[PDB]
Design a protein around this ligand. Structure first.
Ligand code: IGJ
Length: 834
């Protein structure tokens, strides 16, 4: 390699936040074979992409325009304001006119080398797609904004330049376990449990005789299993556990080269806190000075009434468990089951993966996928096949195949969930890791989010940082030096600000309030960075369209919270931006922003589910991005306050609540009565939409402090790092805005109940998609969630197996529960914080 080729790898390590050219925490070469095996699909995608559309990354949608956005179109006319230097003129356009077709009409109504770019953003309107199919144009319609675009030169694709390049039973010898230290107080006991697993299913289990837990425990015991060597499926894990359950460690029995794992291994294990993705990891603990280590050794046509039972089994939810009777029925009528794509997760669960001949029969089954391949993509079904219950490479590949049909608009909606799904792959190089890699290198928008998602996990997950860092490096080596440049500027800014956030917290106390001495201390620290090595301009990580310029120090502050975060304001680095408004970012340390990311992503999916049934529930999924360990960025919502501060305005630090304050704050932050009516209108949909969503997600009972509202009536829920009770927040202040004064029906209450049940019914139509996203959220995002109890809440919330009116009743009852209590639960929320 070249001297400069090492400076490139050094840059990559600072970007990724982990050194992938590291061999200190491996007992094989799978990560090096994965860096090697990922050069091929990167090169093929870098080569197949059109440089022009790659540089301009048009954000497009093939979905139809909704009935609510059509009602905004007055006489089949859409106006675009085209700007140039100091002048501009409006253009009467048709929803089908492609960017080129309307550029030709601008040049006629009065050089042919300029493209259309949205003012202030790095967002372009290019390609053979109608204007109504550009997401920025749909955003302007929905929020009543005007379309502003500037006539300028298309970015040079030369900036996107990529740098050149046996029939015997299986047995295992347990030698012993060693730990450096353990306190001299409790004289405990210990044993080793070896499991052969595949898709969380335990094929076989052997334990050791229990010996006294000391700093070194030798057994020298051969543990013979019943499963023959040939019967071992690919992806089978040898899960070794220490119970007194304090420690665990996995080792793949079939390596990446299809070779059976043989020889001597001294594995550094993980410790338990106090089921989840972290438990399936092939990674070993990097902490060799403090961790426990086990040392092992390997020296090896159907009848009508049965059709009804089958069809009923196929018609159950993802969490309905399969009896042995059910699995035998599905396997025997294997070919009838194959005619129903909905039965695929259940049919592949019925397979006896520890039987070679039965796996071979399943592979024969998969070879007749005329029904599967010609079926409409069901993301819920496809995700169902990519969770912890599926470890077969070919079962997982039919699902990844179905994802290939997804447009970039939809890949963005499921990206964080698909990135977390890599945690369930037996091997580092997988069809899913390749699909993500390929889709990232193809769209800049997806590559940016892919970068931040992969980077959030590398920074706070030792269990999967090695794997994700190899996937990130493969992406980072194909995005091009324009993207590599932006990521560098973004990484520097977040690191400098993360140092300042952690320094400010230690200075004060989580027991006290912010002082003048802490705010002046922050201003002197920010002034030091600005005129020194703080990048001249960085791209907002949660809004890559925006380029934040220099800080606005005289408006930055330390928030009067308990996790003392930084409220930062930046100037816009685009002189073409239509407004002089700053870019506000909140920098916080002390909560898991990954849990907030996951909720906001479900909230965006729920918004698209309502978009299908022509429903706009006015949700405000704000920007939130996890940048490292318990730290990250959150969007500042302009002209917005909390429901608590509206209550403390009338009476401070209580307790005391009044029903009439929310409707008085709205009539105040309104210039005209027309704008005030629009606020009550926006509150009817945003309140209804948040009531529905928050209930379904089990995060319905929050303090009014974590619920904000904008000066334009837009109510929104915030801070999901958290999770007598209530289903959702419908306090008597919200109800007063809607014209109801407890046990009385007003026109806006009829409207709220109407949209509520219609939004609820609309979500119930995607029950399996919501169940599957939720169950995956709990395994890949929380400390630990029980695989049969914690999830069951969402089945009860979405009322599985009930008719469309008995469920309507259940939700209408939940409306009445929050009205009976009123402010009863809210008072307790203030006694709990004192
Ligand atoms: C959206 C958003 C979500 C968050 N989730 C978790 C943690 C912090 C968050 C901050 C957010 N952003 C925001 N923009 C503006 C604000 C604001 N919070 N606040 C309250 C102070 N921090 C908490 C806010 F209730 C205001 O008083 N103003 C003027």
């Amino acid at each position: 390699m070249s001297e400069e080729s090492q400076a490139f790898q050094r840059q990559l390590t600072a970007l990724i936040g982990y050194d992938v050219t590291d061999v200190s925490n491996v007992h094989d070469d799978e990560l090096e074979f994965t860096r090697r095996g990922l050069v091929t699909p990167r090169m093929a995608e870098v080569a197949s992409r059109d440089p022009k559309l790659y540089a301009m990354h048009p954000w497009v949608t093939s979905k139809p325009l909704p009935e609510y956005l059509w009602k905004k179109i007055a006489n089949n006319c859409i106006f675009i304001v085209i700007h140039r230097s100091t002048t501009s003129q409006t253009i009467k356009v048709s929803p089908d006119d492609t960017p080129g077709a309307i550029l030709q009409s601008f040049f006629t109504k009065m050089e042919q080398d300029f493209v259309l770019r949205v003012c202030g953003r790095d967002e372009y309107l290019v390609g053979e797609t109608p204007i109504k199919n550009f997401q920025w144009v749909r955003h302007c319609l929905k929020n009543g904004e005007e379309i502003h675009v500037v006539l300028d030169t298309p970015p040079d694709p030369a900036l996107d330049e990529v740098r050149k390049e046996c029939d015997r039973k299986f047995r295992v010898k347990i030698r012993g376990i060693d730990i450096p230290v353990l306190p001299r107080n409790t004289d405990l006991t210990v044993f080793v449990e070896a499991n052969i697993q595949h898709g969380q299913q335990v094929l076989c289990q052997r334990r050791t005789s229990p010996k006294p837990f000391t700093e070194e425990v030798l057994w020298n015991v051969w543990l013979e299993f019943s499963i023959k060597i040939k019967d071992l499926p690919k992806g089978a894990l040898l899960n070794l556990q220490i119970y007194c359950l304090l420690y665990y460690v996995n080792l793949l029995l079939i390596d990446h080269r299809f070779l059976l794992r043989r020889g001597e291994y001294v594995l550094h294990m993980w410790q338990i806190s106090g089921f989840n993705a972290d438990k399936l990891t092939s990674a070993t603990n990097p902490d060799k000075e403090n961790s426990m280590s086990i040392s092992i050794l390997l020296d090896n046509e159907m009848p009508n009434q049965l059709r009804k039972q089958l069809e009923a089994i196929i018609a159950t939810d993802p969490l309905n468990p399969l009896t042995a009777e059910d699995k035998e029925l599905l396997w025997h009528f294997r070919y009838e089951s194959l005619k129903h794509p909905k039965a695929y997760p259940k049919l592949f669960s019925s397979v006896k993966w520890g039987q070679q001949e039965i796996v071979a029969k399943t592979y024969q089954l998969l070879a007749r996928r005329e029904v599967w391949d010609q079926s409409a993509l069901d993301v819920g079904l496809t995700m169902q096949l990519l969770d912890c219950n599926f470890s077969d490479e070919n079962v997982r590949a039919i699902a990844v195949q179905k994802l290939e049909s997804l447009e970039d608009d939809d890949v963005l909606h499921y990206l964080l969930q698909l990135v977390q799904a890599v945690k369930f792959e037996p091997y580092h190089d997988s069809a899913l890791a390749r699909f993500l890699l390929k889709r990232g290198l193809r769209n800049k928008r997806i590559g940016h989010f892919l970068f931040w998602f992969l980077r959030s996990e590398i920074a706070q997950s030792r269990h999967y940082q090695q794997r994700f860092a190899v996937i990130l490096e493969a992406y980072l080596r194909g995005c091009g030096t324009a993207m590599l440049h932006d990521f560098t500027q973004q990484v520097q800014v977040i690191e400098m600000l993360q140092k300042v956030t952690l320094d400010i917290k230690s200075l004060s106390a989580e027991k006290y309030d912010v002082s003048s001495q802490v705010i002046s201390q922050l201003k002197q620290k920010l002034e030091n960075l600005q005129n020194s090595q703080l990048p001249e301009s960085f791209r907002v990580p949660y809004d890559p369209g925006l380029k934040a310029g220099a800080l606005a120090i005289e408006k930055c502050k330390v928030m009067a919270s308990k996790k003392k975060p930084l409220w930062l304001e930046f100037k816009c680095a685009d002189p073409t931006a239509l407004s002089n408004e700053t870019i506000g970012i909140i920098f916080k340390h002390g909560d898991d922003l990954r849990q907030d990311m996951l909720i906001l992503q479900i909230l965006r999916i729920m918004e698209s589910i309502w978009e299908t049934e022509s429903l706009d529930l006015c949700l405000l999924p704000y920007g939130c991005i996890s940048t490292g360990d318990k730290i990250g960025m959150i969007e500042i919502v302009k002209d917005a306050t909390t429901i608590a501060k509206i209550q403390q305005s009338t009476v401070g630090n209580t307790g005391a609540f009044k029903d009439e304050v929310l409707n008085h704050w709205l009539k105040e932050k309104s210039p005209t009565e027309e704008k005030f009516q629009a606020a009550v209108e926006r509150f009817v949909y945003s309140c209804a939409g948040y009531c529905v969503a928050t209930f379904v997600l089990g995060i319905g009972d929050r303090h009014n402090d974590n619920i904000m509202i904008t000066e334009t009536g837009n109510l929104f829920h915030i801070d999901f790092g958290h999770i007598e009770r209530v289903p959702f927040v419908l306090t008597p202040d919200f109800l007063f805005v809607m014209g109801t004064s407890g046990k009385k029906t007003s026109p806006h209450f009829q409207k709220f109940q109407d949209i509520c049940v219609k939004a609820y019914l609309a979500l119930r139509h995607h029950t399996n998609l919501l169940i599957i996203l939720f169950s995956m959220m709990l395994m890949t995002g929380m400390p630990q969630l029980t695989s049969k109890e914690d999830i069951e809440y969402i089945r009860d919330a979405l009322t599985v197996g009930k008719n469309e009116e008995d469920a309507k009743k259940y939700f209408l009852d939940q409306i009445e529960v929050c009205r009976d209590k009123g402010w009863t639960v809210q008072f307790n929320w203030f006694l709990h914080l004192v």
